[PDB]
Scaffold this active site. Structure first.
Site, PDB file in Angstrom:
ATOM      1  N   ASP A 127       7.037   8.239 -14.951  1.00 59.46           N
ATOM      2  CA  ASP A 127       5.760   8.814 -14.503  1.00 59.46           C
ATOM      3  C   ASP A 127       5.829   9.480 -13.108  1.00 59.46           C
ATOM      4  O   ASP A 127       5.002   9.198 -12.238  1.00 59.46           O
ATOM      5  CB  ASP A 127       4.654   7.733 -14.576  1.00 59.46           C
ATOM      6  CG  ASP A 127       3.221   8.228 -14.457  1.00 59.46           C
ATOM      7  OD1 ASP A 127       2.902   9.291 -15.049  1.00 59.46           O
ATOM      8  OD2 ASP A 127       2.411   7.543 -13.794  1.00 59.46           O
TER       9      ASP A 127
ATOM     10  N   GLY B  84      -3.425   3.241 -12.765  1.00 58.30           N
ATOM     11  CA  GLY B  84      -3.373   3.227 -14.224  1.00 58.30           C
ATOM     12  C   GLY B  84      -4.006   2.011 -14.869  1.00 58.30           C
ATOM     13  O   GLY B  84      -4.955   2.143 -15.647  1.00 58.30           O
TER      14      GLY B  84
HETATM   15  N1  LIG Z   1       0.425   2.790  -7.060  1.00 59.17           N
HETATM   16  S1  LIG Z   1      -0.731   3.943  -7.370  1.00 59.17           S
HETATM   17  O1  LIG Z   1      -1.756   3.309  -8.132  1.00 59.17           O
HETATM   18  O2  LIG Z   1      -0.016   5.082  -7.827  1.00 59.17           O
HETATM   19  C1  LIG Z   1      -1.454   4.415  -5.821  1.00 59.17           C
HETATM   20  C2  LIG Z   1      -2.410   5.344  -5.621  1.00 59.17           C
HETATM   21  C3  LIG Z   1      -2.787   5.537  -4.306  1.00 59.17           C
HETATM   22  C4  LIG Z   1      -2.135   4.744  -3.425  1.00 59.17           C
HETATM   23  C5  LIG Z   1      -2.292   4.661  -1.965  1.00 59.17           C
HETATM   24  N2  LIG Z   1      -3.028   5.514  -1.251  1.00 59.17           N
HETATM   25  C6  LIG Z   1      -3.096   5.387   0.077  1.00 59.17           C
HETATM   26  C7  LIG Z   1      -2.402   4.357   0.719  1.00 59.17           C
HETATM   27 CL1  LIG Z   1      -2.532   4.140   2.444  1.00 59.17          CL
HETATM   28  C8  LIG Z   1      -1.626   3.481  -0.071  1.00 59.17           C
HETATM   29  N3  LIG Z   1      -0.922   2.409   0.483  1.00 59.17           N
HETATM   30  C9  LIG Z   1       0.070   1.659  -0.191  1.00 59.17           C
HETATM   31  C10 LIG Z   1       0.261   1.472  -1.574  1.00 59.17           C
HETATM   32  C11 LIG Z   1       1.333   0.664  -1.762  1.00 59.17           C
HETATM   33  C12 LIG Z   1       1.938   0.203  -3.064  1.00 59.17           C
HETATM   34  C13 LIG Z   1       1.243  -0.959  -3.771  1.00 59.17           C
HETATM   35  C14 LIG Z   1       1.186   0.443  -4.377  1.00 59.17           C
HETATM   36  N4  LIG Z   1       1.799   0.333  -0.547  1.00 59.17           N
HETATM   37  N5  LIG Z   1       0.984   0.951   0.408  1.00 59.17           N
HETATM   38  N6  LIG Z   1      -1.610   3.684  -1.383  1.00 59.17           N
HETATM   39  S2  LIG Z   1      -0.991   3.721  -4.275  1.00 59.17           S
END
Ligand SMILES: NS(=O)(=O)c1ccc(-c2ncc(Cl)c(Nc3cc(C4CC4)[nH]n3)n2)s1
Ligand SMILES: CC(C)CC(CC(C)C)O[C@@H]1O[C@H](CO)[C@@H](O[C@H]2O[C@@H](CO)[C@@H](O)[C@H](O)[C@@H]2O)[C@H](O)[C@H]1O
Ligand SMILES: NS(=O)(=O)c1ccc(-c2ncc(Cl)c(Nc3cc(C4CC4)[nH]n3)n2)s1
Lengths: 260, 262
Positions: A133, A21
Site C-alpha cells: 500500500d 484503514g
Molecule cells: N498510519 S496511517 O494511518 O497511515 C497515518 C495517517 C496519518 C498519520 C499521521 N499524521 C500526522 C502525524 Cl504527526 C503522525 N504521527 C505519527 C504516526 C505514527 C505511526 C503510528 C502510525 N508515528 N507518528 N501521523 S499516520
C-alpha cells in the site's frame, strides 16, 4: 476509545492524530518511560471481529522486524479488549497533505524523498516482506525533510486503486517499486497518471492502458526512471526498493537510470 | 539474572552480550512481537537496593527520551528484577575494534567521530550530558554505523576519558562529552591514550594539569588541530556540543582546517 483512556494502565491517550484503514492513530504517553508515543488502536467495530484482530496482530509482528530511520518504529503491542500497537511518535505531515498545498515538489526534493523511501522499503524487501500500500498517505514528512514509512497493515476502495500494481489489480517487492513510481510521478508533475471517476476505472487503467507521458519540462533521466518502474510486467522492473533507490541516486548525480 | 529465564512471560534471555556497572546486556527474544531484542537487566546484587533501582529507572527514562539512529533505542521497561528492552545492534564496541586494529585509518576515525558527535547532539539538544563517553560505549556495526549506549550516569572507567572540569567536580555540560570524544579521537588516530599511569587519581590529575603528548608527525595538521582544540582544559574555549564538534570533523574530512569553536 476517547482522550482519558489509559491502555493496560500505562498508555494514557491524549490527541487523536488520524483515522487510518482499520485503526485510529493516537498521540499518547507511556507512564513507565514518561515519553510521548503514537498508538494505533482498532476501531470499536473491528475490535470485536477476529479477522480484524489477526490482521492487526500481523501489522505489529511485520513492522517490528524492520529497523530503519525511514520506517516508523514499533515499541509494543497489547490488548486492554482493545488491540493496540505502540509506535515511535513522528512530528510530521503525510505527503497526502504536502502535495495538496504544494501541488508538486522540486527535482531535488522529490528525488531525495524517493531514494529515502526506496532505502526504507529495501529493509522490508530483504526481510521477504511486501508493503502492498505505498501512497502519499502512508509516507510521513517531518519539517527536517525526513521520510517515515507508515502502515504495513496489508503487508504480505479508490485509495489503494490510484497507485495499485497491475498484478495486484489482477489478483511482490516489484509491486512496491511500481507504486512508488506512481507516487514519484504525482510528486514530480502534480497530477496522477491514471485518473477517473471510479476506483475500478483507475485500477483497470493500471493493467491495459499505458501511462500518460510526463511534462517535457522534466529532464530525460527522471522521465526514463518513472517509465522503468511503470511497466506492466513485474520482471521488466526493479525487483526491490534498493535497486530502484540505486537508480534514483544515478538520476540525482546526473547519470541515466540503469536496467534491472 | 540466569540464561533461559523468560521476563514477564515475554522476553526470553538468550546470551550475555556484556556486563556494565549497574546491569547486564543480554541478547534476547520478544515472544510477543517475534523479534530479537537486547535486554539490559539489573545485576542480582543491586536488584533490591533502592539507590540502584532509581539510577536504573532514570537510565531507562533518559534513553527512551532520545530518538536518533546513532543512539540504541528503548522499546519497553519492566520489573519481573528491573529490565530494559532495547533495540538489538549487530555491532562491536570501539574498545575491542581498537584492541585488534591498534589504530583506525584517518578515513574511519573521522567518520566514527562525526557520527558520535551527531548522535550526542540529540542528548545535548535535549539538555542532557552523557558523562561516560568512551570506546566501550561506542558500538560499531559491520556496515560502519555508530550506536551510542549507556546513559547510566547521565545528568541534565571514567578516569581515562574524564573531562578536566568533570574531574574537578564541576557541573556537567555538553563540552565535557566533546572532550571525552576528543580522547577517543586521540586514541583512534594514534593507537594510544594521551594520559596513562597505574591508578585513576594520576590519570584524572593528568587531565587537569598535564598537556596531551604531541600526536604522530605522520598525521595531517588539520587532523592534529581538531584533536588539540577538543582537548583544551577550559570547556568555554571548546566545542559547545556534539553538533559543532561534528561540523568541525566535517570540515577536516573535506580537507580543510577545523573551525574555531563559537
Ligand atoms: N498510519 S496511517 O494511518 O497511515 C497515518 C495517517 C496519518 C498519520 C499521521 N499524521 C500526522 C502525524 Cl504527526 C503522525 N504521527 C505519527 C504516526 C505514527 C505511526 C503510528 C502510525 N508515528 N507518528 N501521523 S499516520
Ligand atoms: C568508519 C567506522 C564505522 C569503522 C569501520 C571499522 C574498521 C574496523 C575498519 O567500519 C567500516 O566503515 C566503512 C565506512 O562507513 C564501511 O565501508 C562502507 O562505507 C560506506 C559509506 O559511504 C560505503 O561507501 C560502502 O558501503 C563502504 O564499503 C565498512 O564496511 C566498515 O567496516
Ligand atoms: N551498554 S554497555 O553496557 O556499555 C555495552 C557494552 C557492550 C555492548 C555490546 N556489545 C556487543 C553488542 Cl553486539 C551489543 N549489542 C547491543 C547492545 C544493545 C543495548 C545496550 C544498548 N543493543 N545492541 N552490545 S553494550
Amino acid at each position: 476509545p476517547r482522550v482519558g483512556v489509559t491502555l493496560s494502565g500505562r498508555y494514557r491517550l491524549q490527541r487523536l492524530i488520524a483515522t487510518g484503514g482499520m485503526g485510529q492513530v493516537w498521540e499518547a504517553v507511556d507512564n513507565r518511560l514518561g515519553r510521548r508515543v503514537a498508538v494505533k488502536v482498532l476501531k470499536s467495530e473491528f475490535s470485536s471481529d477476529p479477522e480484524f484482530i489477526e490482521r492487526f496482530r500481523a501489522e505489529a509482528r511485520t513492522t517490528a522486524m524492520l529497523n530503519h530511520p525511514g520506517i516508523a518504529s514499533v515499541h509494543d503491542y497489547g490488548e486492554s479488549r482493545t488491540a493496540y500497537l505502540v509506535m515511535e511518535l513522528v512530528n510530521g505531515e503525510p505527503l497526502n497533505s504536502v502535495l495538496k498545498r504544494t501541488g508538486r515538489l522540486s527535482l531535488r526534493h522529490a528525488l531525495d524523498m524517493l531514494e529515502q523511501t526506496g532505502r526504507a522499503l529495501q529493509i522490508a524487501h530483504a526481510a521477504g516482506l511486501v508493503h502492498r500500500d505505498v501512497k502519499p498517505g502512508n509516507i510521513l514528512i517531518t519539517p527536517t525533510g525526513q521520510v517515515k514509512i507508515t502502515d504495513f497493515g496489508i503487508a504480505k476502495v479508490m485509495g489503494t486503486a490510484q497507485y495499485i500494481a497491475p498484478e495486484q489489480a489482477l489478483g511482490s517487492p516489484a509491486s512496491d517499486v511500481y507504486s512508488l513510481g506512481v507516487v514519484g510521478y504525482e510528486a514530480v508533475s502534480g497530477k496522477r497518471p491514471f485518473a477517473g471517476d471510479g476506483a475500478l476505472t483507475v485500477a483497470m487503467k493500471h493493467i491495459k492502458e499505458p501511462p500518460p507521458p510526463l511534462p517535457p519540462d522534466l529532464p530525460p533521466n527522471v522521465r526514463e526512471l518513472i517509465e522503468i518502474t511503470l511497466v506492466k510486467n513485474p520482471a521488466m522492473r526493479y525487483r526491490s526498493g534498493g535497486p530502484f533507490a540505486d537508480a534514483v541516486a544515478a538520476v540525482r548525480a546526473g547519470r541515466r537510470p540503469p536496467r534491472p
